[PDB]
Amino acid sequence: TTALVCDNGSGLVKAGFAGDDAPRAVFPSIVGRPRHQGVMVGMGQKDSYVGDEAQSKRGILTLKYPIEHGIITNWDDMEKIWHHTFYNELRVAPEEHPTLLTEAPLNPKANREKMTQIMFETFNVPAMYVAIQAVLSLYASGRTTGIVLDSGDGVTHNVPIYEGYALPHAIMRLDLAGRDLTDYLMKILTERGYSFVTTAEREIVRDIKEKLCYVALDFENEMATAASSSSLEKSYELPDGQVITIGNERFRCPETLFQPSFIGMESAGIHETTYNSIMKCDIDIRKDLYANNVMSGGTTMYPGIADRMQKEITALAPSTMKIKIIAPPERKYSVWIGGSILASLSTFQQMWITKQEYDEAGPSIVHRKC
Amino acid sequence: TTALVCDNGSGLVKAGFAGDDAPRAVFPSIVGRPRHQGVMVGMGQKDSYVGDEAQSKRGILTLKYPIEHGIITNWDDMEKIWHHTFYNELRVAPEEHPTLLTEAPLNPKANREKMTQIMFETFNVPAMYVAIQAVLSLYASGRTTGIVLDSGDGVTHNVPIYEGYALPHAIMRLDLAGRDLTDYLMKILTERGYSFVTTAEREIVRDIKEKLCYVALDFENEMATAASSSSLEKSYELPDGQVITIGNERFRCPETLFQPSFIGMESAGIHETTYNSIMKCDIDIRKDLYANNVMSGGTTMYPGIADRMQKEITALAPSTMKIKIIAPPERKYSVWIGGSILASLSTFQQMWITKQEYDEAGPSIVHRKC
Amino acid sequence: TTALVCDNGSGLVKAGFAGDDAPRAVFPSIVGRPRHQGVMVGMGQKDSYVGDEAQSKRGILTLKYPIEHGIITNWDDMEKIWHHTFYNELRVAPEEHPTLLTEAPLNPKANREKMTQIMFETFNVPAMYVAIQAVLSLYASGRTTGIVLDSGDGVTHNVPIYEGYALPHAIMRLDLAGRDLTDYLMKILTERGYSFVTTAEREIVRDIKEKLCYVALDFENEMATAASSSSLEKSYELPDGQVITIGNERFRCPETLFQPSFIGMESAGIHETTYNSIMKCDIDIRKDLYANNVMSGGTTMYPGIADRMQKEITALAPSTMKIKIIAPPERKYSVWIGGSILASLSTFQQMWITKQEYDEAGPSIVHRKC
Amino acid sequence: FSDIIKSRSDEHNDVQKKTFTKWINARFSKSGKPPINDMFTDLKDGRKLLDLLEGLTGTSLPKERGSTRVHALNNVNRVLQVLHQNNVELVNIGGTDIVDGNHKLTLGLLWSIILHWQ
Ligand SMILES: Nc1ncnc2c1ncn2[C@@H]1O[C@H](COP(=O)(O)OP(=O)(O)O)[C@@H](O)[C@H]1O
Ligand SMILES: Nc1ncnc2c1ncn2[C@@H]1O[C@H](COP(=O)(O)OP(=O)(O)O)[C@@H](O)[C@H]1O
Ligand SMILES: Nc1ncnc2c1ncn2[C@@H]1O[C@H](COP(=O)(O)OP(=O)(O)O)[C@@H](O)[C@H]1O
Ligand SMILES: [Mg+2]
Ligand SMILES: [Mg+2]
Ligand SMILES: [Mg+2]
């Protein structure tokens, strides 16, 4: 009996089968509902569109995400997303397979509690297990000594791990992920003229970001270069047929990850929460935590990030310490790959939360078994 | 050497003298050109009427605004409007007086760049300065801690300000204002019979909106109240001589402000943008932003708006927080009044953009001086 | 010619006048810089708030403590806090009064050295003496034979004293005080849902701690009781207007003092460093050092600790020695009270470090005069 | 010790206020300027600091022909600029502190000026 590994992220939902090397079906986790007036009597107009279907029919919809900053705000439609991904996407019977769920560190307890309650009392799965994300990232990277930097569309957190021994007093969660990057971008386009207000236009801005924005190496120098118009400009063709040309704000958007004063936040950029998390650990651990900085999650897929990050760290760490960032080319699905690896381990398969244990204990059992 | 304070909004152009307490000249910013055939060989028919002149002789003109939604669309005639202000209304060679222009937040940079380029390279003003509106409104209201709800005919934008320290990461700019309310009114009249199509007919619809439309308090109740025909009807007399009677649509035109779904927009009414702009600020600031919501601009001169706004905000603010709406009586001119105050200060004088500095740097000097 | 006694703690600075019975003026020792953009020309805005002023004008500020863990990590602005205390809080001329400063045991020598250098070459005091914080406590309590345990926002001493003869081989220092308790509370508040991140919110978390947290008499019992909901919960009300309800993280925050593994530390709790500091002393001394445990310092004011500490010690010390914990009601200002006493002893005027001695010896005279 | 320090600080403020106001009144009465009675309310609008400061120095100081709050803050900014030009080093002294009438601070800069000249 195989198991289900659905990395129910806060942006796309990457789900699949325990054991494989790649998720079956991924898709944005947006539940859309029509807003315009419908006048055609003989239609099979569905109530609410969810997934890439909704992502296809935007100009009628109010796209809303159920998950914001990791936590789940609307529990009604998240049920719809799970229903969709179990029937229409994988076409499996949930009553047969154990399910693996992922989460971020420092999340409300009610989150995982109600998640378990919905997974059992509604889908009647045989067993369920929710595992922290940045541990599965190490799993997939095949290490046992790293300081993961998970970040995308939601939260951004480090979890230092020495030898299968996490250091829970040195994880550094931060709410500065791709969604805030997207909003800052669609706020900063207005300087050139193009305004994107609706949610159907927020998707267009996210898409611009995903394929036009890189990370500078030296931000001030790149800014001074872009002043004398040069090869920075790039043209993008909206679904309307018009073209826009963003020259300067191709690195000013993802520079937020390093100067979160651009959005009014006080925290220090990802180049420094990492260093603070390392310094929170023990002396004997820092020397080989500096060496394995696993990066995971989408937002770490900008072009020049595995280099500005490295420079910004070696500018902080002692002069005689070897820094290496481990950024695999599939650093977007690494969480799910680790999930598939873990759920297919001969040792682990006795750690699930079987339905018997839930019925004998209650939803407060995830805090006990996880 | 007194300076000039000409706040040229989207609609009326209120100009005057720095220091005084009232704008000398007020007139709509339209530029009319004739269309009908002219058959009189001696007449001195000018080329393009502009101002309230072009308003009175609007029977044979195609009225047209240069400014749409704050930004400037046609420059050849905005030049005409500035020329009119300087030479016919005020009659003052600008080569002596400095000038204080006003813009809106989140406007294309090229807008203010070309604005200052014109001011220096066509009027040779000795120094100019472009200041955001929702700051001058606070100036005029004598506060230093408010959240300015400015809105007239082009925009509707909040700017939260705690103590001279604006929070540019929390200014919300909704693009829905008097012109959209006027278009909706003229589109909603035609369900009773009256059809207003030409630009002159649009000016007439505005002259209706300004003096027959109020804001409901409980809109859903006011509907069923005005259902059973009652004191709601009014009778307005077109310049032709005939009369009309709008009963219901005198409070459905400005209810658009609170539900911009009536005109197909997706955004949230002016109350939720105020509440969100408050919630973006810090906890210590929310308490005394909830108490000073300085309204400004024309569109906020509807009769029952100071109370609908307060009820709607109290409905979503915390229970134990005190809400007060600072709606001064002459808030229409509050922006210009604040401009007159600001230019008449003594410390301000080191903020002008001297012509020498423009010759040094060029038009880009505005982004660094303002 | 009276003298000054400023217990420059690591949290709130408490200064005053020698001979008196209460500090004239106490205040948190935080220097804040405004971070948002300031747009109001006629303001007389300073550039560095400090003390209760910075504590109030807080939403615009990046609060920062100059002193951390007892040592001074920013001399630029610690000088500002001293300037504030001398000129605005007390309004006295430093060139007239001698100053008495306090410090913690086992502190870097450079700390007191630079402290003396700054107090001479900058404020020109005629005489200055720096005393250890856990001896003024005995002075204030009137004893001469005790084992002081002062703590709060940076340190936790144990200076056992038999008869004016400190035993410096039995002083235990431990950096487990108010600030670490505050950060731990702020970190466990997440699991309920509430998320305080910035410094302006760290202040609110500290204030939640001060007036909601108590120390359990039996932790494993209180925890199992708070599982079945009872009178444990409370309700703090932020300046935002929202309320929070912490029920469990009320004795789990200050339980850190007794189980420092809760924050990831090896060192044993304060209930055991006391016992170790006693056992390091002589046999003929423990038999009455047990009977005088002068608690001092801020963070020893929980509605608990004065009894759970005694309960935890009488389970270590032999069943014959009679244990007693002297917890006076003002066990907070006890250090400054002792300062006001010691500075007003007739036999003390031959202890100050006169300016002549500083000029003839350099700043390294503190080690030989103290 | 149920936090009695409040009254001690308030009485200290009183005894400082009496001497300070007597000094500023004796200084106002030399140049033919009307005397004041309230230390903490007759210094809001920041005007009385300006002529007092010019009598302390011996030069001219203009005033903004206004009466709103921003005018008060501009006057106080003038005062602080003048003070800084004489190397009077204040720290937690801002424009809003005077115009809000902050006792702990409104007699902090007076003591600064006193200590500078007298
Ligand atoms: N090529 C890319 N470059 C930059 N950012 C990207 C790219 N692809 C995806 N992202 C960002 O990653 C986010 C989704 O990443 P992911 O790690 O899957 O989020 P989640 O963990 O919530 O599933 C998107 O919001 C997008 O902003
Ligand atoms: N007395 C009034 N009652 C209601 N609405 C008004 C009134 N006067 C003006 N308006 C609306 O205000 C708009 C003009 O606002 P105004 O403050 O002139 O804008 P701007 O900032 O562009 O100058 C007009 O479009 C009109 O719809
Ligand atoms: N009643 C209280 N209960 C719990 N903690 C307190 C209480 N009063 C003060 N504290 C803590 O004590 C700290 C101040 O203690 P104090 O001894 O004055 O510091 P310092 O040693 O720097 O003077 C504060 O940071 C606060 O965390
Ligand atoms: Mg991820
Ligand atoms: Mg306006
Ligand atoms: Mg202390």
Author numbering:
A (entry chain C), B (entry chain D), C (entry chain B): 5 to 374
D (entry chain F): 18 to 135
The authors write:
The cytoskeleton protein actin can flux between globular (G‐actin) and filamentous (F‐actin) form, and this polymerization cycle is coupled to various cellular functions. The structure of actin is subdivided into four subdomains, SD 1–4, and contains a central pocket for ATP and magnesium ion. The presence and absence of γ‐phosphate at the nucleotide‐binding pocket induces conformational changes that leads to opening and closing of DNase‐binding loop (D‐loop), respectively (Kudryashov & Reisler, 2013; Merino et al, 2018; Chou & Pollard, 2019). Here, we describe the electron cryomicroscopy structures of phalloidin, lifeAct, and utrophin bound to F‐actin, providing a comprehensive high‐resolution structural comparison of widely used actin markers and their influence towards F‐actin.
The UTRN‐ABD contains two calponin homology domains (CH1 and CH2 domains), and previous structural and biochemical studies have proposed both the domains are necessary for actin interaction (Winder et al, 1995). The purified UTRN‐ABD was used to make a complex with F‐actin, and the map was resolved to 3.6 Å resolution. From our F‐actin‐bound structure, we could redefine the boundaries of ABD sites; ABD1 (amino acids 18–33), ABD2 (amino acids 107–126) and a newly identified ABD site in between ABD1 and ABD2, named ABD2′ (amino acids 84–94). Additionally, ABD2′ is the only site that interacts with the SD1 of adjacent n + 2nd actin monomer. The binding site and architecture of UTRN‐ABD‐CH1 are similar to the recently reported FLNaABD (Iwamoto et al, 2018); however, in our UTRN‐ABD an additional amino‐terminal helix is visible, extending toward the barbed end of the actin monomer. To validate our structural model of the UTRN‐ABD:actin complex and the newly defined ABD1 (amino‐terminal helix) and ABD2′ region, we performed mutagenesis of key interacting residues and co‐sedimentation assays with F‐actin. From the ABD1 helix, we chose residues that have their side chains facing toward actin; thus, I22 makes hydrophobic contacts with P27, V30, and Y337 of actin residues, and H29 engages in a cation‐pi interaction with R28 and R95 of actin. At the core of the CH1 domain (ABD2), we included N109, which makes electrostatic interactions with actin K50 and H88 side chains and the main chain carbonyl group of S52 and V54. The decrease in affinity by V87D and N109A mutants indicate that the core binding is mediated by the ABD2′ and ABD2 sites. However, unlike the FLNaABD, where the CH2 domain showed weaker interaction and poor density map (Iwamoto et al, 2018), we could not visualize utrophin CH2 domain in our reconstructions indicating flexibility. Co‐localization analysis shows that the UTRN‐mini versus UTRN‐ABD labeling of actin is nearly identical. Together, from our structure and cell labeling studies we conclude that the CH1 domain of utrophin encompassing ABD2 and ABD2′ is sufficient for F‐actin interaction.
